[PDB]
Amino acid sequence: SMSQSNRELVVDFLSYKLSQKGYSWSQMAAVKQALREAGDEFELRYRRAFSDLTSQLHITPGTAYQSFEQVVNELFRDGVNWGRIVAFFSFGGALCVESVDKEMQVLVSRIAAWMATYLNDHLEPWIQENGGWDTFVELYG
Amino acid sequence: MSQSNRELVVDFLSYKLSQKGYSWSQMAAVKQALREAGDEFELRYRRAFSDLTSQLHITPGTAYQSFEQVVNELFRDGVNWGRIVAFFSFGGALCVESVDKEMQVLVSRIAAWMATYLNDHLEPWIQENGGWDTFVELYG
Ligand SMILES: Cc1ccc(CN(C(=O)N[C@@H](CS(=O)(=O)CC2CCCCC2)C(=O)O)C(=O)c2ccc3c(c2)CCN(Cc2ccccc2-c2ccc(Cl)cc2)C3)cc1
Ligand SMILES: Cc1ccc(CN(C(=O)N[C@@H](CS(=O)(=O)CC2CCCCC2)C(=O)O)C(=O)c2ccc3c(c2)CCN(Cc2ccccc2-c2ccc(Cl)cc2)C3)cc1
Incomplete structure (x- = not known):
């Protein structure tokens, strides 16, 4: 597990240094980076x-559970778009921070599962129809 | 598709937690402290x-020879956390240089030489100096 953890640290550090020069380790690392930045930007602009x-x-x-459902259902009430997807991630982030603030970090594992489930079941059909995560990467950059 | 979405969620949440001085996991705290120490080293030196x-x-x-000559000179006088940071920074520079020169094939190779050197020549010192958790504590 020590050998695979070191491999993971190499990959993470190299992904970072490549991204600082407008390059990417992989298609996935490019998606993770563009979303990290779009989240920051959304939080600053809004x-x-x-x-x-x-x-x-x-x-x-x-x-x-209730806060998650109330907000996410309201967010996608009028449909799916990339901007709303960014806001969805930003909201998940805020919900996790708040859970940790309230000494309820256990809720972070639950929020992460609700986000992955919502993405797989309710966002992935729109995402794939509209070019996939590579199209978001192109639109953002 | 399900595991890729899980990866995106984990990455984004790790980031947002780290911005507030929290962490998704001990591995996420190590990745973040090293990302910052690399930036710092690159600025200072x-x-x-x-x-x-x-x-x-x-x-x-x-x-490969370029990697080995530099890495051997770097740890000639021994291993320390600062030299480990500089090792990562060197790997990073070697990587961006390869992409600049349209040599994207080499990226994957540099990563394997780094992982091997870390596992075989740096990990004994690391484990006998408190592990990556001690690095996180010393840096922050
Ligand atoms: C990085 C970034 C993200 C979003 C935006 C704003 N933008 C936009 O500019 N849209 C474009 C067309 S696009 O989306 O195709 C462009 C792509 C291009 C590639 C990636 C960047 C966007 C346009 O209108 O021309 C929205 O669609 C947008 C999305 C969501 C919400 C808003 C605006 C306004 C605030 N609104 C509150 C809300 C409503 C209901 C429920 C909840 C919440 C809620 C509150 C707080 C939080 Cl933390 C989260 C959600 C959420 C700007 C920058
Ligand atoms: C964030 C940061 C990292 C490293 C350093 C520099 N530092 C230091 O200050 N050490 C401390 C004690 S410590 O290490 O416990 C502090 C820790 C503890 C907490 C985590 C981070 C800091 C001390 O002075 O006592 C070195 O040991 C150090 C390491 C490497 C090199 C230098 C200094 C000087 C320049 N030297 C060139 C070089 C020489 C030979 C071969 C190769 C290269 C080469 C060229 C380019 C590059 Cl990109 C990389 C390496 C590389 C400062 C800041």
Whole structure:
């Protein structure tokens, strides 16, 4: 496990250094990087929407399950687009931070599963029809 | 498709947690501290970086020898965390150089020489110096 962990650290570091020069380790690393940046950008440009939602997540005694469903269903109520997909990831991120703040980091494993399930079951048909994650990479960069 | 989506979720969530001083896992904290230490080294020792960068002409033939000559000179006087960071930075430079010169094939090779050197020549020191968790603590 020590040999495969070292291989993982090499891959992660090299992916990073390549991305700083506008190159990519792989198709997957290019997707991870563009999404990391689009998330940061969305959070900075929509600072007001981000801050209002995070205040509500902090205040609510409601379950992370309920907050997840309320927000995600409202977000995709009018359909799927790349910008809304970025906001979905940003929301997941905020929900995980809030869970850790409340000493409920166990909820992070649950949020990650709900995100992967929502992506696989409700976002993947639109994603594939619209060029896949490679098209998002091209649109963002 | 299901495992790729899981990978994207994990990567994005690891990032957002790290921005708030939290971590997805101990591995994610190691990856993040090394990413930052690499940036820091590259800034602090840009002179040594830039001087080495220029003298490097990469070809599949000369690529491995260039890696071995530099790495051997780097750990000639022993292993320390700073030299480990510089090893990663060197691997990174060798990689971006290969892509600049339309030699994308070499990327995968450099990564294998780095992993091998880390596993065979750096891991005994690391385990006898507290592991990567000690690096995380020392850096932060
Ligand atoms: C990086 C980035 C992402 C999104 C945006 C804004 N943008 C946009 O510009 N759309 C384009 C067409 S596109 O999407 O094809 C372009 C692509 C190109 C490649 C990647 C970048 C986008 C346009 O309108 O011309 C939205 O569609 C957009 C998406 C979602 C929401 C907004 C705007 C406004 C705020 N709104 C609140 C909300 C509503 C309901 C439920 C929840 C939440 C919620 C609140 C807070 C948070 Cl943290 C998360 C979600 C979410 C700008 C930058
Ligand atoms: C973030 C950071 C990393 C490294 C350093 C430099 N540092 C240091 O300051 N060491 C400390 C003690 S420590 O190591 O415990 C601090 C740790 C602990 C926490 C995690 C990070 C820091 C000390 O001075 O006592 C070296 O040991 C050090 C390592 C390597 C080289 C130098 C200094 C000087 C320049 N030298 C050129 C070179 C020489 C020979 C062969 C090759 C190359 C070569 C050329 C280019 C490149 Cl890209 C890489 C390597 C590489 C500063 C900051």
